[model samples]
Target: SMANDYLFTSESVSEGHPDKVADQISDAILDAILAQDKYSRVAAETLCNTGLVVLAGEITTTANIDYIQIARDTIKRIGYDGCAVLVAYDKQSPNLDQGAGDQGLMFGYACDETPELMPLPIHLSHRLVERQANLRRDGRLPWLRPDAKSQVTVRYVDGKPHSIDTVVLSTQHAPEIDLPALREAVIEEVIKPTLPADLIKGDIKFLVNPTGRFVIGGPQGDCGLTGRKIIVDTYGGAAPHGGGAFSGKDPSKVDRSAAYAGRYVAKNIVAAGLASRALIQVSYAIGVAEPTSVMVNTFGTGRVSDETITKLVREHFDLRPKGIIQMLDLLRPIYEKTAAYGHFGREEPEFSWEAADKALALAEAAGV
Candidate 1:
């Protein structure tokens, strides 16, 4: 049973990727608040397409920022030039101001496979896009443009990745570059560096700008919206999602807060050697100080009983919105960085939930 049987899948998108561009803008807005009033409540959202970037959401603070100008400045910083392809809108929605989106729990995950504690497939996939962006930005590949996407398919034998079977990379580029050369350069520089050499057993097809010419890309090619790429944002479709968006909301919004806390809980459990893999979910109702439910699934990899892990989580971790903000110092303005790539996979200090502070306590409580 430990040999010759399985398939696994994961996906990743680039920072220049349209939806990601929107994510970055929204998070940047959160960062602004964190910078001025660490106590300010910010709900920022962004929509990008063609020549426009729309910034919308609610805020409860006195920071006084010209959001429209901030939006334009963000677009410029993202490598977008020429007014023909850049525009922005900052509007307030009174409806959202009515009440916090119905409370619910959020989740986080980590594994020992990578230095970042992230899963290998998703981690490697992100590096693909990151490398592509670097190449273009660093002048290593001058003709390479900003927008890009990547995907990976790994063959698993006995529950571990044996080899990389397929890799897809779609990117936007300048008009004059040769297609074949672009593909070769990406393979040699970006893809190769991110993945281990031995992982390539045989043919690994690399699709560089698969649909032919992608010279005119980004919002000019497609409309990008906030939270549209939730799967890409969370577990890359590897696990279940509560369908809550992280960007464009304040910490009190449980959709954002609970998710952050969930990840913290799950990661700590796994780090405690309670599970080789884990998935956690917590939910709540508006104005509620406690979660409606808290659940964990290790998919049978738990070294400790799942029930014991659950008990430890409730006892040691605070799943409340205020609790998360206080525990992680979420009120600070550092969200812009979380707007893209993958939120659950970050290891930054500001992402305190990523810390496995509960590992020892969890082990002690579970008697592991």
Candidate 2:
């Protein structure tokens, strides 16, 4: 027999987190390149450590951007004063305009658990970490720094989120602040304002810096690399990840562009009311125009058959890398904004994949 109740957890990191800092640096270079060259082929990567940030990967672009300057600016904006950077980038393969950059699979997921169609655990997880950044930037939490992490566990009963089990937030701060004051203020200012009333009950567990002090963080604490936070970037373990990183890559790479297409397709499917949850997967071979396969998994939540929805998705949306770029308007300087926080569930205009613009069309066709 299936279990009636379950617990789910998701985690998020702040912009100052070393991995996020690397992600932002990579995407910043991408944005600057795309800003000048719409057809720029960029596959950027970054590595961050104590006092140095290294930029690597192949990039074929005519855009004139100071590579070192972008990394420096990104590090500074992330709440650090001074840093060093090293650059290593090469040109993409001979022809980048024709087809997929490499062979890979991309998965996109959506659900009706929240208004944004994202899982509630990850949804709330993002808020706590996001709130920490706001407090620091706004100067309300003067002791707060950039590096932080948030995790949320939710009790799911009858396949729906019933209540919160625990909220764990670990934030970097100044050395002078004590644990007692930090925990109380964090709950009152950051956690309280972000959590919804219905999802929380009296005596809910809130763990702040559970291990104790978190004074020295950012790159000083650990090594940061691009693509390390793939789970945090997408469904937060609610769905399968295709093992491709989105940041530091241009729209031509099916890994980034097709994933966006999958999210667009999945979001539209759930928005069309054909399914309460949806996952879209697409695979492609390098230098090929058509996808090797396309799949849809609704986990028994579909109003109709998964096969029918898959057919409709294939008919309604274009999975080709070039077509996806054109369909989603992905060739812009809008990638840097998605480098931090949860990318798929964002409400920002730059997150074009999150838009359910095709909901009406899909609903009309699906008869949902």
Candidate 3:
């Protein structure tokens, strides 16, 4: 059982999902600070549960924005109940806040798996939720509520995905709708259009809204905390994570900044054809001048030595906060948009780390 067959599963959440709503609020605050001071240091955090939102963290900037209003707007944008009361926790303890804890390396990854250079499972997973939100937003699925989720498990033969073995989806809806009808509608209209034609093989298992009802979503039924959906936020269990949550913290926090840099480096490597799969990592220390360490792995697909690739990464990319922010243009009001779906592998223009401009340079540096 262990030698030839294995199952890999991954999950996704919609924008109105409680955890994503919290991520959006945190990033919204981060964007506000970045808008005024590109170099602002922020470690914003948020929580939403039972009609209340609590905004917290440390900020070292002069930009003035209404924190409460931002929090409420984010919640509302994620389709929360306006009548819900929100609470902002202003006081910060040294334990709760301060300069970002440490300098650490963040990683970004991409491959030729899709046009977006993102993994196939996660790329398709994100499209499902994105299409779900779009359908509801555009009134195409008027009865469809704001929150939804999707999961896909691909069966691999000889290290390449050949078919889909299972799919799990959850969506919030109005109290009066028929669950059976909803499931059929979602399968016919949403899920089918996003996935490949032949991927569904051998009576794929489907679980739609397995819990039955999701009407009371978005901080009403579940508690939401910032940076909690770390796996869904990145590669969707395809690779290892450094445990740094991207939402709510400013780029000065390497969790956000270094991670962006990692993506940039990894994407370039893949685009350069030096590797088919790559992971780049860098670590930093608080108030330290540079990263404590830098590493690169090509998963045995590298055309060159890992050490040579590592040297090229150092030569081509910036590992420090200021350097990363400048390289990726991270200081902007664009963060709120990155709070949902998957951040690292998106093709959106604002996601500059996805750009492969350095691919040629990386190739040259690798002497390939």
Candidate 4:
């Protein structure tokens, strides 16, 4: 059994964070191509710094995509006003062309710790940053800029989330804004409204802009690459990563599709009462039609053997590159929304991978 008491922390970055800005731009390109041609294969990567954005990767499609315009628009939407961006690509490599992008392992995790089947620390962390964006856009915090980051520490009892111990939020703001006033407003307007009251246990610590100042941020203060924020994009270190980034890659790349499929499988297992928590790993090889390995770890919480649950997953879920796309209906303009926040816990219709609709069926099959 897991320990009764412990502290776990997770962090989240706003869409205006430099890395997230790059991720959004990459996904924006993916969305554009998918909108035009459902079969488009896009492996776009974007890098951003002060006064510059660069788009690079392999994209094979009949779709007419204005790569430069997409990059510029995404940058603008992310609250970065700039020019001097570069867009370039290389012809497909004949040696590895359409062979599965690259070989890699992907991980997915789920738990009953939160209503969304996500770990409590990460789930709450995402809400904090999301609320920051909302307040900024709604003029509740007019001094707020786009770039921001949030972290939360949850105290766990009996391996379950018990209370929130600490919350740290840092957001970029106008130059004239006073630090004390900014901190106060963020606590009252952003943090309080977002975090659950009950979880705010005794003497909770709120650290707003711990660095004291954040007037200069976004790409101006940092360089960003598309895949750099993979941890923020997934389980916030509550789960393992396959080392491959999801943004800018098409469904044909198992890195994105298989990971989504794995999350679907793991979430279904937990929701089905087959387990209280689940971690799934799926691996593939170049040009392979099926996964090289499929693993399930239920953390001794399964009512049945892990092997049985694995069998159920194999039967109900399709992990192949193309099969995943079909299973999740991925060839749509849904990539842009996934660019920010953790992807799995989202309650959007396009995020079909997060659905637990398969739980009943899996439970029935497992004789639960």
Candidate 5:
């Protein structure tokens, strides 16, 4: 229903959640492999349960890696059990290993929802869970565990967010901690501090651990596999996705590289003031040197024509698989950290794709 006024929501999970843990482990393995051999073709996936982790994927690498140890160390560091890990990897097949001609029409989106050009709901949601992890890591709230999630509902009027009407924060904690204790600490420390103070209006309902228990979390409580949280990894369902997961894949795959390039293009477009919101789509075909198609849609907010925007994108950025890899410098071991935080807006320098570095050139090129 396209109502006159509406509420949009998005959710984010903490780094300790089972799904996120799997993502981190997979990305950690990818980083380790890439750090040693930058040209390695890794498509590692991770599966985790109570006391075991299974690593299975197609990988082609010259690097000597101890995949099992990397899994154990990542799990232990993430405050989970350093349990055993099973590895099943082999030579990378030419069948679909390359990204030169892939159907991954990756979508990258940006908007004036926040300084980072990300949607409000997902941004706030990610911060809430991130705060939980921070408070736990800093020992400010010792009872907090790694597994947690946050949901935010933003009230929009005339296309802009008016207020945060609801916040749902749930986190695992020790049994000794009462619901009341957890609620107050989370309200005071996480949600209140993370969200914009002005956006706090109405009798907002802050629900913290509604079930009143989250003792057994992480893989101990539920089984998890890699790439299960794609929405959380990208725009939090606020934008379209190509159904390709970012975790466990090297930049050689458009799922990882071109998707990143899409963001780089979109973010820079918004940053250049050519648009208040931007969604860029780039498609590829097998063995194609360049993207088969490139599109830019500004949702009527563009200062220039979308066609002009498309022209600039094609002329300026390298949309090819290899071009995207070199342009964003994606060969580094920078992905493991991206597994938890909403990948678009952490503003990490390693996330080169998020940089609006091309804004000036784009703006001038658009004759704005």
Candidate 6:
């Protein structure tokens, strides 16, 4: 039984965040490589600091790519340019030629708290930062710069989100924008328009750029490396990560594919009303075609037993690396879009993992 009343907070970072910039660059290069050859093997890593970006990893592919240009174009698209960027990727080592990127475990989760079947705090947190980016790119908030983060605190009643308790948004900006003016404008333009009105039961707290000023940010303000924001890339710390990064890798790696499969399985179970919330775990060994273990825990919200749900998951989902890839159609150029905003709950054609296509089948099979 889950607690009836409690507080849960989750945070999200915008694409402009230094870590996300690194993720975007890594995934952008991944997408380019996959665009040329679906079978390309990539384990790309990216690092960022003041006026410098470095790309280093191992790749084995027939695809010819300009790594430096990909890094530059990705940064430019994220609103950064005219910086020193370096690429140091090389051919995959023969010593590790035929195995998963590395042996690891991955977890995925889903719940009925939001329209997308995601936990409430993380869903709203992503939207807050996403809205910031929209405003900046549309010129509505011209002074708004890249590198922003958002945190949302939700009060839960009976295991459901009741109202927003607080929202914290810290954004990088131009020095010309006064702190008071920026705060006011952000509350009105970004926060107010984005958050649902009903969730704002009177007197909800809004802290915009609480630091009072953010004149310098992005890679210039802090160094960034790939896989640094693993929490942000998944469920905003609402769920567990398998200690692997999603960006800069092809689908052959179980780290990315198995995680996606876990989300797909858990989401479908919740969608079928078999559970109010669910978490799925999958493990794999290097060079193994099949997952080492598959499991499901509904947090005691399951209408059916956890064992039954696990059985249904095995029957309906594929846990093998190649099977997961084929099941999700993951060998496309869709990696870049998933580099931000917590990938699991997105409602996009490219995000096949979020689909509830298995809900009906599970319901029928479970006799729910």
Top of the candidates by lDDT:
2
How many clashes in each candidate? Answer: 12, 0, 6, 0, 2, 0
Each model's Cα RMSD: 3.4, 1.9, 3.7, 2.4, 2.5, 2.5
Where is model 6 more than 4 Å wrong at Cα? 1-3, 92-101
TM-score of each candidate structure, all chains considered together: 0.90, 0.96, 0.92, 0.95, 0.96, 0.95
Tens-place lDDT digits, model 6, residues 243-294:
9888998888888988898889989999999999999988888887667788
Regions more than 4 Å wrong, model 1: 1-4, 82-101
Candidate 6: lDDT over CA atoms?
Answer: 0.87
Q: After superposition, how far is residue 204 of candidate 4 from its true place, in Å?
A: 1.4
What residue runs in model 4 are displaced by over 4 Å at the alpha carbon? 91-101
Q: What would the per-residue lDDT of candidate 2 be over residues 1-368, giving only the tens digit for each residue?
A: 25679889999999999999999999999999988898888889999999888889988877888988888888889898746677878765332246776999889999999899998888888888989999999999999999999999988888888888899999999999999999999989998788888988875899999999999999999999999999999889999888999899998888888888998899999999999999988999988888999999999988889999999987888788788988899989998889998888888977889899999988898787
**Pairs that clash in candidate 3:** 103-284, 104-284, 105-282, 105-283, 108-262, 108-263
The candidate, 1 or 4, that scores higher on TM-score is 4
Writing each residue's lDDT as its tens digit, candidate 4 over 1-368 gives 65688889999999999999999999999999889887787889899898888989988887887888898888777776546788787534222223455799999999998888998888888999989888888887778999999999988888777788899999999998998999999989888888877788776899999888898899899999999988988999899898889899888888898889989999999999999999999988988777889989998999999999888888998777877877888888999999999878988999989989999999898888
- Expressed as tens digits, the lDDT of each residue in 1-368 for candidate 5 is 14458889999999889999999999999999888889888888899999888889888887888888888888878876447667887755332223583566789999988999998999999989988888999999998888999999988888988888899999999888989989999999999999898889866889899988889999999999999999998998888998888898998888888888998999999999999999988788877767778899998899889999999998889887888887898889999999997778889878898888999999888877
Could you tell me which 10 consecutive residues in candidate 4 have the lowest summed lDDT? Answer: 90-99
Question: What does the lDDT read for residue 325 in candidate 5?
Answer: 81
TM-score of 6: 0.95
- Whole-structure CA lDDT of model 1: 0.76
lDDT to native, each model? 0.76, 0.89, 0.80, 0.87, 0.88, 0.87
Q: Which ten residues in a row have the lowest lDDT in candidate 5?
A: 92-101
Per-residue alpha-carbon lDDT of model 3 for 246-338, expressed as tens digits? Answer: 897776677887787888888888899888888887777787646788888987889999899998888888776677777888777789989
In terms of lDDT, the poorest run of 10 residues in model 6 is: 92-101
lDDT of 1 by residue, 117-205 (tens): 66778877777887888888889988888888899887877777778888889888888988888888888888878887778876676
* Candidate 6, pairs of clashing residues: none
